[PDB]
């Protein structure tokens with residue numbers, strides 16, 4: 001089992017880290033949601049789908065930068081919603097193909113009432129997401145760590 005990002009980088013068998021740069025919504029109001037769909041960005045595959053089932057969970061989601069200060073969020077993992085920054089680990093999605101498929105996570109962030117001006121800054125770290133891979137074959141328990149960066153400023157009008 002390995003993963004890749006849409007821009008290039010790969011995390012190989014056994015785990016690692018990688019950076020993911022994402023465009024964010026330029027303007028979001030109090031009462032609106034910023035959606036950050038990471039499933040257009042991170043993809044994974046099973047290296048032996050013919051006997052092995054890989055189980056993948058979102059083990060941890062943390063917020064950094066402006067997301068941490070200025071937003072409150074939920075994370076949607078494979079169609080279900082949990083608070084964000086995460087307070088538990090998610091259920092498991094299955095991987096059973098050798099074709100890369102999205103890791104189905106999206107963040108939903110809405111600005112807190114005190115937010116105004118530039119609420120997220122271009123180039124900055126906004127989240128660290130940990131993907132955890134295990135299987136029905138051995139004791140492998142691996143961490144794929146995704147460091148998420150903003151490509152642009154996000155403004156909360158005021």
Ligand SMILES: COC(=O)c1cccc(-c2ccc(O[C@H]3O[C@H](CO)[C@@H](O)[C@H](O)[C@@H]3O)cc2)c1
Pocket residue numbers: 001002013014045046047048049052053054134135137140
């Ligand atoms: C045609 O023959 C094959 O393709 C073939 C034939 C023999 C062995 C294997 C094999 C076994 C374990 C293995 O281990 C890696 O891949 C597993 C499946 O993703 C994960 O469960 C693990 O954690 C680890 O990443 C990767 C590949 C593949």
Ligand SMILES: [Ca+2]
Pocket residue numbers: 002045047
């Ligand atoms: Ca491979």
Ligand SMILES: [Cl-]
Pocket residue numbers: 002003004010011
């Ligand atoms: Cl890959």
